[PDB]
Assembly symmetry: C2
Homo-oligomer: 99 residues x 2
């Protein structure tokens, strides 16, 4: 699925009026990517812990070629996929992917 | 934010009909986690890409005192690094966190 397929995901799980399925998802990244950049820890049930956390602010290796460094972390992306989808996955196409 | 905060995040980015803000987001996580679990490549425009991959895990008993068994049930709900959210993070104050 994606910013469009997901519109159908709500346009079908919901469908009510197709509100902005295309616009709410277009804004979803605008709020997902923008919230972390707005300063808010979005949290999807228990799988997408959207929340920014700094972890880098330098990377110029010494006067050599590959001795890169990094002293100071600036905003980052703490969030990640949780087990809510893996538990849902162990329940629908987990073995389907195995074979 | 969360299954309700992000709701208004789209209910406001939408404001068309507030479709089911409650049913589209509660189901969006139910479909986000359920799609990857259904076995579809869930993703977000160009910053997130949740994808499940048949995998497994084992060596922590359970039916007794837990700490010794040997199974392997664990799909791999991978994901992506939406830089649009990290680059947006540069917008919130990435360096401000580095200092």
């Amino acid at each position: 699925m994606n910013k469009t397929e997901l519109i159908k995901a709500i346009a079908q799980d919901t469908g009510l009026t197709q509100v902005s399925v295309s616009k709410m998802l277009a804004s979803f990244e605008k709020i997902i990517t923008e919230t972390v950049a707005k300063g808010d820890k979005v949290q999807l049930t228990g799988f997408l812990n959207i929340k920014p956390v700094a972890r880098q602010a330098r990377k110029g290796f010494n006067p050599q070629t590959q001795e890169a460094l990094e002293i100071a972390p600036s905003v980052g992306v703490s969030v990640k996929p949780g087990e809510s989808l893996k538990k849902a996955a162990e329940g629908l196409k987990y073995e389907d992917f195995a074979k």
